[PDB]
Design a protein around this ligand. Structure first.
Ligand SMILES: [Y+3]
Ligand SMILES: [Y+3]
Length: 133
């Protein structure tokens, strides 16, 4: 049979609340794929693979329900940080079908450089799904 697939690209995900939601929902839905980002503060990619119903549900989650631009606060050993996200965004970039699915669950990974990200995507035959800048 045939696997439905979607891919999204974000400018930032330092927000722990966003991270939680993406996790929990991937968990509850039986979707497969990954979320990769260049360092804690960099851009990245979400890839999702499953049946049509689940993919559209996730599309809704990510493009409609999540406030990618919502301000949040971080706490450290030297003090507090207020993060304003007015210029963060999410973008849905690819949409289609696969005969083959190389992902084995749904996982996240923070990479050190863009090449580390591209190398990873390539282990799953997916270098092309990303758009560098
Ligand atoms: Y249909
Ligand atoms: Y703001």
């Amino acid at each position: 049979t045939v696997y439905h697939c979607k891919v999204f690209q974000f400018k930032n995900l330092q927000n722990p609340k966003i991270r939680f939601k993406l996790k929990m929902n991937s968990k509850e839905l039986s979707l497969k794929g990954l979320c990769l980002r260049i360092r804690d503060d960099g851009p990245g990619i979400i890839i999702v693979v499953g049946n049509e119903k689940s993919c559209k549900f996730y599309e809704n989650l990510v493009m409609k329900r999540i406030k990618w631009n919502e301000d949040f606060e971080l706490h450290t050993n030297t003090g507090d940080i207020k993060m304003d996200m007015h210029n963060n965004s999410i973008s849905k970039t690819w949409e289609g079908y696969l005969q083959d699915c190389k992902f084995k669950g749904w996982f996240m990974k923070v990479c050190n450089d863009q090449d580390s990200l591209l190398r990873t995507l390539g282990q799953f035959d997916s270098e092309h799904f990303y758009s560098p800048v």
